[PDB]
Amino acid sequence: DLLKTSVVKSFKDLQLLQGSKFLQTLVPQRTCVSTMILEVVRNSVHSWDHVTQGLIEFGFILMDSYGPKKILDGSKMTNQHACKLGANILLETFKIHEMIRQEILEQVLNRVVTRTSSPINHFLDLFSDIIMYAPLILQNCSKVTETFDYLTFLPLQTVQGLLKAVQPLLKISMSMRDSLILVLRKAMFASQLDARKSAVAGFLLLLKNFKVLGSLPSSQCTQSIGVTQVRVDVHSRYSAVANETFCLEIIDSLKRSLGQQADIRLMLYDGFYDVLRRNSQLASSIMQTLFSQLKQFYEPEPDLLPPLKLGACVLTQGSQIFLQEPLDHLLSCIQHCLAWYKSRVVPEELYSELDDMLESITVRMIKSELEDFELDKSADFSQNTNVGIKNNICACLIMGVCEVLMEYNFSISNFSKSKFEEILSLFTCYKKFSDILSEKAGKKVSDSLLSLKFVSDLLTALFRDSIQSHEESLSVLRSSGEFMHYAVNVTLQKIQQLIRTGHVSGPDGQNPDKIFQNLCDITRVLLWRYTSSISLLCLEGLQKTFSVVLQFYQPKVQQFLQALDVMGTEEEEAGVTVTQRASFQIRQFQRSLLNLLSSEEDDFNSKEALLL
C-alpha cells in the first residue's frame, strides 16, 4: 500500500509540475519513485532473492489495480503511468533473472485465460514483449502451448491478441505451428459458438500470410499431399503443391461454417478480403465460395422484383427469430473482391458472372417498391411480434444492400451521367427505409457499410471543384443536397466510431496505416470545404479528426500536418517543426473565429464558435 500509493503520488506530482510554469521556476526537477524502482530492478542482478520475490508481486499489483477497466464496458493518466511501470518491472526483471522467467510467464498467462470479464489487453502486451525479447527461450514452452487448449473457451478478442502476440513463436517451432493447427481444427467441430468463432479467426489469420509464415512446411502442410517424413529438403514441385493443396483444404473447411450462425458468416466475409489481397492464388477459390453463397439468395428470373431473397436470411425456431447471413455483407465482400479481381490480376467466366449479377441486382433493387418487400403501412415492424422483428431485419438488409450497390456502382463508372442516377436511386431507396425506421421510433449508428476508402473518395469527388466538362455527371449527386450530407454524415460517423473503438466497419477496418491515410484524405477535403448545414458538419468532422490523430496516431502527428499542407521538398524537414506545422494550422482556425466574431450578422453561431 505504501509503495503503490507512493508511485501514484509521485506521478501526480511530476504531473503538477508540467501543469504550471509557476511551479517550474520554484521547484528544480524531482527524481520520481518510478525511476527509483526501476533502478532497484537494475541493482537486483547481484543476486537478491529476497527483492525479486516482492518485485514480481508489486509488478502485477500495479498492473492489476491500475490497468484498464471501464474501457471494455460503457486522471486516467496516473493509472496509465502506474500500469506502464507495472509492466516495465515485470518485463525488465524478466530480461535479468533467468530462473524467474518461467515464473513470471506462468503468472502473465494465467491472467490471460482466467479473467475473461476484465480487459486483459495490457497483459497481452507484456506477453507480446516478453516474446519479442528472446523468442528462442519460449519457443519450447509448454505453458504457451497449453494455452491453445483453452483457446476455445476464451472470448474472441483474447484469442486474437493471443494469436497476434504468438506469431513470433510460430516462425520458429514447427511443432507449435502444428499443435496450433490441430487445436484450431477440432474447434471447427466444437458445439460452443465461440470455439468455432475462434477457429475461423485462427484459420483466417493462417491463410492471411502463408507466403510469409508457411514458407517452411509444417507437418500438416506436407501431409496434405501425403508426405509424412519430409524435412530439411525441398524439391519444389511437391513443396509448392503441398502448400497450395493444404490452403485449399483450409478454404474447404472454412466454407462449411458459411452454413453456420450469422455471426461466424460475417466474421468470414471480413477475412476473405484480406486473404485475397495477400495470398493471391486463393482468388478463384474465394470468388468461388462467395459466388456459391450468393447464388442461394439470388433470384435469377429477370423481372422477379426482389432480386435477392430476403426472407431466406431469417431463420425461425420456437418463437425466436434470428438473422442468419448478412446478405448485405455477402455483397460487400463480393463487391471489394471483384474490385481487386478486375483492377489487379492481369498478368475468367467466374468474376464475369458476379459482375452481371450485381448489375442485375442493381437494376431490380432500384425499380422494386415496397409491395415486393411487403412493408410500411402493411407490415408495421413491431418488435414485440414475430411479424415485426422479421420485418425489421429486412428493412436493415435492404439498407445495407443499397449501401453496397451504391458503393459498387460508383466504382463501375466515374464518367457516366447515367449510373449516378442509379447511385441516387439506390440512395433514395436507402433513405426510404432509413426514414421508415426512425419514424417508427426504434432501437443506425455504425450501420454504414461504406468502406472508409470510398467515403474519402466520395467526399473528394463531391467537394472537389476543378470539375472538367466531361465530369459534369457529378452534378447528379452534388445538387441533391440530402445525398450531400448523407455522404458527409457517414464520414462523421466513421470518424466518431474511430474514437469509441479503435476500428472502422469496412475493409481495412483495423489497419493503423490504412486508417491514418484516409484520415488525411478526409481531413484535407473537409478543411477546404469549411474554408470555401455542410460547413458546420465539415467543422465537426474536422475537429473529431484532429483529436483522434492526437490520441491515437500521435507519433505520426508530423506526417499528418504534412498531409494537410502542400509538398515541401527536403531541406525543410530540417526546417519544419511540429510547432511550426501546428501554429500554421492554428492561425487559420483562429482567423475564421475572429471573422466569425467581427461580422455584424444578427445571430452568431454558437455551435460553430464552440467547436471552432
Binding site: 501431409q223 508426405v227 485449399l248 466454407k255
Partner: protein, 283 residues
C-alpha cells in the same frame, strides 16, 4: 480417346502424361458444370456414369497416372482431378467406391522417392467434401479400412474421420470406434482425439470414460498425459464431480517415473488452475 478421355477434354480438362499436371482450360467450377452437362446429354445417361468411372479406373491403373489425378491441376491453383470429380454429385458415389478399391494395393507400400504415400493421398481426397451423397456407405468403407489398416497408418485415418465423414454419420462412428477401443489399447490415443470432436450422447460418452479408466493400466506412460487431458476436458458441463471422483480412484488404487508423474501433474495442475469447475469438484 475413350468415353472418359474424350468427355474430359470436352469439359475443358486435358489429361497430361508423366509427372506433369493435368491441365484445366476453364475455371475449376466451369469444368464441373461442363462435365455434368456432358454426362446428362449423352445418349445413354444411366449407363455412361459407369462408362466414365471405368475409363477412370483403367487410366488409374498406372501408379504415376494415379498420383497425377490425386494432385492439383494446372491453369492460381485449383484442386485435383479426382477431387473435382468427387464434387459432381451423380459421379460421386461411384467414384468413392473406386478410390477404396485401389487403396489396398498401396496400403502396405512404403513411401517412394518423392515421399508421397499413395495410401494416404487417396483417402485425403475425401477431406472436407461439400456434400456426401451416399453417407452410410462412406462410413462403412472407412471403418472397414481402419480395421485392416497398418498400425502406423490407421492412427491418421481415425483422426481424419471428422474431416472425411459428414455431420449426419457421427452416430454410427461412436458405436464403431467404441468397439475398436475394447479390442485395442493401442488405439486409445487417436480414438479419444476423435471422440472429442464428434457429436455424441452424454450417455454414450459416460460409457467411454469407464472403458478408458478401467484399461488405463495397459496404456503407455507417454499417453497418460494425453489421455488424462480427454478426461478433464469432458468435465465442462456438470458430470464434473462424478468424473473426478472416478479419475481419483483410478489414480489412487492403480526418466519413466519422473517424466510421467511430472507431465501428468502438469495437466492436472493447469486443469484446476484454469477451470474452477474442476478444483471445486476435487475439493
Amino acid at each position: 480417346g475413350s468415353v472418359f478421355v474424350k468427355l474430359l477434354k470436352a469439359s475443358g480438362l486435358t489429361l497430361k502424361t508423366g509427372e506433369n499436371q493435368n491441365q484445366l482450360g476453364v475455371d475449376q467450377v466451369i469444368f464441373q458444370r461442363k462435365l455434368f452437362q456432358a454426362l446428362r446429354k449423352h445418349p445413354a445417361y444411366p449407363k455412361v456414369i459407369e462408362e466414365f468411372v471405368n475409363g477412370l479406373e483403367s487410366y488409374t491403373e498406372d501408379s504415376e497416372s494415379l498420383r497425377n489425378c490425386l494432385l492439383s491441376c494446372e491453369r492460381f491453383y485449383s484442386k485435383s482431378l479426382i477431387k473435382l470429380l468427387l464434387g459432381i454429385d451423380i459421379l460421386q458415389p461411384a467414384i468413392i467406391k473406386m478410390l477404396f478399391e485401389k487403396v489396398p494395393q498401396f496400403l502396405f507400400e512404403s513411401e517412394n522417392r518423392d515421399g508421397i504415400n499413395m495410401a494416404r493421398l487417396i483417402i485425403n481426397q475425401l477431406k472436407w467434401l461439400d456434400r456426401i451423397v451416399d453417407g452410410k456407405d462412406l462410413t462403412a468403407q472407412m471403418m472397414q479400412l481402419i480395421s485392416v489398416a497398418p498400425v502406423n497408418l490407421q492412427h491418421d485415418f481415425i483422426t481424419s474421420l471428422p474431416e472425411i465423414l459428414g455431420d449426419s454419420q457421427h452416430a454410427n462412428v461412436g458405436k464403431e470406434l467404441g468397439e475398436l477401443l475394447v479390442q485395442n489399447t493401442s488405439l486409445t490415443v487417436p480414438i479419444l482425439d476423435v471422440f472429442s470432436s464428434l457429436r455424441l450422447d452424454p450417455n454414450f460418452l459416460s460409457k467411454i470414460r469407464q472403458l478408458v479408466m478401467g484399461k488405463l493400466s495397459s496404456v503407455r506412460l507417454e499417453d497418460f498425459p494425453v489421455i488424462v487431458k480427454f478426461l478433464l476436458h469432458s468435465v465442462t458441463d456438470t458430470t464434473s464431480l462424478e468424473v473426478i471422483a472416478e479419475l481419483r480412484e483410478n489414480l489412487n488404487v492403480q526418466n519413466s517415473d519422473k517424466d510421467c508423474i511430472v507431465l501428468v501433474f502438469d495437466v492436472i495442475k493447469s486443469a484446476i488452475r484454469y477451470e474452477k469447475t474442476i478444483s471445486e469438484a476435487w475439493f
